[PDB]
Design a protein around this ligand. Sequence first.
Ligand SMILES: Cc1cc2nc3c(=O)[nH]c(=O)nc-3n(C[C@H](O)[C@H](O)[C@H](O)COP(=O)(O)OP(=O)(O)OC[C@H]3O[C@@H](n4cnc5c(N)ncnc54)[C@H](O)[C@@H]3O)c2cc1C
Ligand SMILES: Cc1cc2nc3c(=O)[nH]c(=O)nc-3n(C[C@H](O)[C@H](O)[C@H](O)COP(=O)(O)OP(=O)(O)OC[C@H]3O[C@@H](n4cnc5c(N)ncnc54)[C@H](O)[C@@H]3O)c2cc1C
Ligand SMILES: NC(=O)c1ccc[n+]([C@@H]2O[C@H](COP(=O)([O-])OP(=O)(O)OC[C@H]3O[C@@H](n4cnc5c(N)ncnc54)[C@H](OP(=O)(O)O)[C@@H]3O)[C@@H](O)[C@H]2O)c1
Ligand SMILES: NC(=O)c1ccc[n+]([C@@H]2O[C@H](COP(=O)([O-])OP(=O)(O)OC[C@H]3O[C@@H](n4cnc5c(N)ncnc54)[C@H](OP(=O)(O)O)[C@@H]3O)[C@@H](O)[C@H]2O)c1
Lengths: 445, 445
Amino acid sequence: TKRVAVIGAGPSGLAQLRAFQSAADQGAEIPEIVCFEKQANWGGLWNYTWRTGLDENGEPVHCSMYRYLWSNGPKEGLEFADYSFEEHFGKQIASYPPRAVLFDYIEGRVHKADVRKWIRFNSPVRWVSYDAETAKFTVTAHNHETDSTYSAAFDHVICASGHFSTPNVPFYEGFDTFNGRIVHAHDFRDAREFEGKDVLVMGASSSAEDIGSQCWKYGAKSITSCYRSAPMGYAWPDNWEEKPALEKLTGKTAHFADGSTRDVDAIILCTGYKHFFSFLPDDLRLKTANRLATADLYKGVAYVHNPAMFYLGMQDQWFTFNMFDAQAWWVRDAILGRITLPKDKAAMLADVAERETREEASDDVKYAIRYQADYVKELVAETDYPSFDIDGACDAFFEWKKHKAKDIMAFRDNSYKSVITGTMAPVHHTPWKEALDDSMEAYLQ
Amino acid sequence: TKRVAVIGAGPSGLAQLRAFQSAADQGAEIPEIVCFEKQANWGGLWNYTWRTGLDENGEPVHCSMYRYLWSNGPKEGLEFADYSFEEHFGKQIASYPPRAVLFDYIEGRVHKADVRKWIRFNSPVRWVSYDAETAKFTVTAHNHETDSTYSAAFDHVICASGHFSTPNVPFYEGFDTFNGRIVHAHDFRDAREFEGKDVLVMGASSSAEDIGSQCWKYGAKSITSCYRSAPMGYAWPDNWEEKPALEKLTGKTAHFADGSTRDVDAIILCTGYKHFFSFLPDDLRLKTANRLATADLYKGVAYVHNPAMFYLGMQDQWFTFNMFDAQAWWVRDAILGRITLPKDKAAMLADVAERETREEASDDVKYAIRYQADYVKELVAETDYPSFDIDGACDAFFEWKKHKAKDIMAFRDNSYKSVITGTMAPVHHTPWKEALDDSMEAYLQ
Ligand SMILES: Cc1cc2nc3c(=O)[nH]c(=O)nc-3n(C[C@H](O)[C@H](O)[C@H](O)COP(=O)(O)OP(=O)(O)OC[C@H]3O[C@@H](n4cnc5c(N)ncnc54)[C@H](O)[C@@H]3O)c2cc1C
Ligand SMILES: Cc1cc2nc3c(=O)[nH]c(=O)nc-3n(C[C@H](O)[C@H](O)[C@H](O)COP(=O)(O)OP(=O)(O)OC[C@H]3O[C@@H](n4cnc5c(N)ncnc54)[C@H](O)[C@@H]3O)c2cc1C
Ligand SMILES: NC(=O)c1ccc[n+]([C@@H]2O[C@H](COP(=O)([O-])OP(=O)(O)OC[C@H]3O[C@@H](n4cnc5c(N)ncnc54)[C@H](OP(=O)(O)O)[C@@H]3O)[C@@H](O)[C@H]2O)c1
Ligand SMILES: NC(=O)c1ccc[n+]([C@@H]2O[C@H](COP(=O)([O-])OP(=O)(O)OC[C@H]3O[C@@H](n4cnc5c(N)ncnc54)[C@H](OP(=O)(O)O)[C@@H]3O)[C@@H](O)[C@H]2O)c1
């Protein structure tokens, strides 16, 4: 029978397995499915490890999450359409669950699906090549359990290896002589480390917002965040200041583009990540900016130069869990023959160009959110993934945006209408800035 | 013509280039030589970078050296037999030159050789395979300058990729909740970070000795080092204590196997490295312990399962620079046909077994030094590499060992007999504990 290789067992790869199992249950014949995962367990970025740099096996650490991390968007906007929060936890929980709770949720669905047997853990993929003569991909992987590398042929490869794990780490004058901690968000683990310290946070996006917030919450003396384009612009706490571009450090003195100066004890680089695939040749390797319209992906999933190769979750993310579902169902259907891809590369390239032009038509944030909503709507209309109230999820994000603009430090103290019932979520039992306990234990009581 | 791929432009790979150049100058026909180097420049571990974890390109950071690092053995034991220190710096320097100074010496030699043109920088090797039908290795590499991967065929591969860069990072109960910095020696950079802190150093070998010493020299409050087998046993300074095995951490409380306890601010894991090759299949991938007799390498260099593949510098090291040379000349001669390898695998395996048994015949430190000395002597006898006074090199290591046993903190304040003259080296212009300046500028005046 045909065989499919899935690279990664994060939310996207897990969605892919769930998709195939769902189709199998309906009586459709499915190909063999083999999922290769570098880590010892599934969950992708939702794993936590104290390790940074390289893991116990010597592979680059995938994890970018830190202690005390909570959902940074409304949970109502990421609910699986086929596995409700209610079905999983039994009851209704708050709108911003901590890391451990969302991991439990992700895990519940694939536990129910009985798809763990398709996964090979501690098995980083080393290489993928395609042979036009045989029409097969050869996947080379290393099993760290046995310390043995092997190769096998597949009819399709679906890459779900994430794009928020290989850091963008710029050099600025003085970085190499600074008497202090300099760490990228990727390797940041414990905000308690910076208690009583003056912290410099470089960047102006999600990681800068939240890591600055963690350092503040866990007692940093002061936060200085610097941008190079547009300021985050929120009304910050009294000990937090936003500066324009960093020019250089001299000793522990940071010099900014406006000529202002500031002594800092540590520097956290929240400068984002790159799309990076250490395991792919030129003819299969996705090269793209991080944005809502991903380069070279037909329908945002099928690699234009070889549409037997697919990619999941490579877009920048407003929507997440249910977007990955929409993609995985779509990719499944393409492989199963429920969807037929163009045999015209020009048509595939035009599809991408339209997506890019439409994304660029406006720089408005609500426009961006609606753009991705439109994408999820597009995909879901084209498979048997259950229709769901995308407009509502959209509204959730809109309200969330307003809540952050109002109070950057208290936006997690809010509730949103479930997309299934339309009922607001319970208020959590402890204000976020007071919620020091990470555990799923403390969260659910 | 035939072609040889050299993986790595550290001391070993550089020695290999030098070896081929020396033969070409004598009128011997040499194969084409292509050297792949992941870093932007040559030098191997001797390159310094402030970066830890992954480099600017997204590749694992090779560098394990830190700020303030000086040569840990007497320079007289690591002189090139074809390029005296005298010839390089013109004059005579001390016996423990800082990193920057030894890098300059390393570079001096290869500059003279005009071998840089054989090197491709920013070009990590991704994979190497061998095809028995064609009798060629296929080497796949990624050029980060152009973001393009390519493949090419070679008649031989010489792997000089180091073995002190992929860390051994053990988990101990409590590591994941410790409120403090936990770094492996590999990512350790600036001792100033631990000034006024209580540091736990885990390990009992070279890195533990020297990193503990740097932390001490740069103002750590206290140093606690722990061993799991044989204690380092030196007379430590008043703020440095040596403890038995770590059991667990609870909060910032370290518990040791003798039941004692110590609160610490940071933990530096000097737990060594593994031999790790992310780019090799089973049938080419060296698997060995770190020791003086390396598994599966005939004469310590030719891979017993495919003797057209060679490895350099994979032994643990008392000797370093001139051992790499001896190996490089020997490998070169095998490739050129000046040396003919056995066609009998059993004989190759027996060579390795003899080396292992002989290494293990005594656990005495001077016996170990003499053992590797004997290895270098063996290799040098078998090529036109210039004989040099190996016995003298030994005597240097012998005196160095005595000096360390005498005063662990002041052994770098000593001199040794130039292997060429027999004249002792001059004393450095500043005692080690006082030389706070890394610069080659200060050292050379
Ligand atoms: C710090 C951070 C916080 C976030 N917080 C939120 C949040 O609160 N809410 C939200 O909705 N979204 C959040 N996101 C977005 C996040 O990307 C998604 O929630 C989700 O983790 C993406 O799933 P994925 O499977 O597409 O990628 P990943 O989760 O990165 O999964 C990739 C998987 O592929 C594996 N892999 C990688 N390379 C290889 C290889 N060579 N061989 C084999 N396996 C490999 C990895 O081990 C990993 O498990 C966050 C992202 C980051 C970086
Ligand atoms: C912290 C530390 C301090 C030391 N101090 C001393 C000292 O004072 N004196 C002394 O004599 N010895 C010292 N040593 C021993 C040291 O190993 C040798 O001096 C020397 O650096 C070894 O040379 P090498 O080329 O064999 O390995 P390395 O120097 O590690 O060279 C390996 C090279 O291969 C490259 N490479 C690796 N993987 C790939 C890939 N996939 N593709 C392409 N290129 C790759 C790397 O970029 C690197 O440049 C020290 C070692 C360490 C770890
Ligand atoms: N759950 C949570 O609380 C949480 C926490 C952290 C992250 N995350 C997730 O992680 C994902 C990644 O977000 P991210 O913010 O880390 O990456 P990102 O969204 O790509 O943002 C990167 C930021 O770094 C800046 N930057 C890039 N290169 C720079 C340079 N050389 N010098 C100075 N600044 C530079 C960019 O500014 P320019 O625009 O000027 O280039 C940009 O603002 C997000 O989707 C987010 O949802 C979640
Ligand atoms: N000043 C300098 O120039 C300098 C500084 C640092 C390093 N170096 C070089 O770097 C090289 C590497 O030396 P290294 O000492 O880092 O590595 P190493 O020589 O292999 O020593 C590793 C040490 O870690 C201990 N260890 C390993 N696993 C452990 C675990 N799970 N728990 C506790 N302890 C554990 C080992 O103890 P056991 O014996 O019990 O296994 C061993 O003593 C050396 O050749 C040295 O020359 C040079």
